[PDB]
Design a protein around this ligand. Structure first.
Ligand SMILES: [Mg+2]
Ligand SMILES: [Mg+2]
Ligand SMILES: [Mg+2]
Lengths: 189, 58, 95
RNA sequence: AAUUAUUAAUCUUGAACGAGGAAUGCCUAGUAAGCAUGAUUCAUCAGAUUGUGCUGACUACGUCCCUGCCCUUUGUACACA
């Protein structure tokens, strides 16, 4: 009987990837009424994976210097975006957001490896934590760039970006950046 | 397009000139030595887009 | 001050020795002073090696080797690190 | 003692600037950034220092690739090096 924002349940949501099941937290300790917890999540290496997923979303939502530390404004933005998401394509907005998180990060990448003095740009593999982090970062950047010098508000932009990310449509920032990363990765090895 | 899941069973070391690369041994049930970017643990799960490929020694 | 007892090469009871040419840089060096290396290599690495195996007839195939026998001059040999720089006592250690 | 206008108050005037080329700085947690404030100077004057608190992230948990410093072997015709 604990709901997100007192409206949405996440008692029935599932992941259905099985690689990202351990890295996104909607369970015992992470079921909260509001995405404000003043925890200590960066003291150890992997403790970042127990911060509730919506709080990580709001943590990346306050960026570009103008907006540093303004946590409550970010929470209001995210809450109204979730209302807009539920209104159209009526579903649980947290389930839509989890689906979008599962799609917005590349599965493989490229880097410089010094095999025997001569080098390449060899393809490598991406870990689940890296994929989750990149999905969050790319969604937030897409929404932020959409709303700059624009008639549409920031929460409308964020709702559109999340919905488009969940549907694999190549009109979102995250999907296209990820496809380009994967294309170069398949090309360099 | 179609991922393949492999389980990390131990971590071997770090490569790259700046050390931003991790060497693992993963198991489907065959073993492979694969080469990863980002923080990893034993027990993590990888989504391999290629199946017939290994990494040189370190 | 005569840093080496044998003068950098193994010649005794002879006047002249014919030279050979460096496998890397083409310089002339006497045969008793050049450093020699003999190599037994495979044609391909192990993954391509197994790929040839099931593309083959005869059901029992072995790839051939390569035999090379290269020779180098001092400058062209220690730039590639076949030979390094040692200390005064360690220089005398043969084998 | 206010002219080359000490500072403050009111109305009027309403420039460049649409995120910054080659380069380059600081930073790992109540920290960066954002936000204001007490003292020093002081007849009068802070866009400066030196302290204090308020709101509060992202990314790593490494390496010797660039830069700097150190140690071992080695060469030296350098020792104001
Ligand atoms: Mg003679
Ligand atoms: Mg001063
Ligand atoms: Mg160095």
């Amino acid at each position: 009987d604990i709901k997100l924002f007192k409206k949405w349940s996440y008692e029935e949501i599932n992941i259905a990837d099985l690689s990202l099941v351990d890295c996104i937290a909607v369970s015992q300790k992470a079921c909260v009424y509001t995405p404000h917890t003043a925890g200590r999540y960066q003291k150890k290496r992997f403790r970042k994976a127990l911060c509730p997923i919506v709080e990580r979303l709001v943590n990346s939502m306050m960026m570009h210097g103008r907006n540093n530390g303004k946590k409550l404004k970010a929470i209001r933005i995210v809450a109204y975006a979730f209302e807009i998401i539920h209104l159209m394509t009526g579903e649980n907005p947290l389930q839509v957001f989890v689906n979008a998180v599962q799609k917005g990060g590349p599965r493989e990448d490229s880097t410089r490896i010094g095999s025997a003095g001569v080098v390449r740009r060899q393809a490598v593999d991406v870990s689940p934590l890296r994929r989750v982090n990149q999905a969050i970062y790319l969604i937030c950047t897409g929404a932020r760039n959409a709303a700059f010098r624009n008639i549409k508000s920031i929460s409308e932009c964020l709702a559109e970006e999340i919905i488009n990310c969940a549907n694999e449509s190549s009109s979102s920032y995250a999907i296209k950046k990820k496809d380009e990363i994967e294309r170069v990765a398949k090309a360099n090895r | 397009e179609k991922s393949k899941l492999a389980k990390v069973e131990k971590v071997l070391g770090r490569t790259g000139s700046r050390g931003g690369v991790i060497q693992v041994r993963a198991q489907f049930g065959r073993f492979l030595i694969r080469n990863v970017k980002g923080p990893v643990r034993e027990g993590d799960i990888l989504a391999l887009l290629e199946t017939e490929r290994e990494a040189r020694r370190l | 001050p005569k840093k080496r007892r044998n003068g950098g090469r193994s010649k005794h009871n002879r006047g002249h020795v014919n030279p050979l040419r460096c496998s890397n840089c083409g310089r002339c060096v006497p045969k008793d002073k050049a450093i020699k290396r003999f190599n037994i290599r495979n044609i391909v690495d192990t993954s391509a090696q197994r790929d040839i195996k099931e593309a083959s007839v005869y059901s029992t195939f072995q790839l051939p080797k390569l035999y090379i026998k290269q020779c180098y001059c001092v400058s062209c040999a220690i730039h590639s690190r076949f030979v390094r720089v040692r200390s005064r006592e360690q220089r005398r250690v043969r084998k």
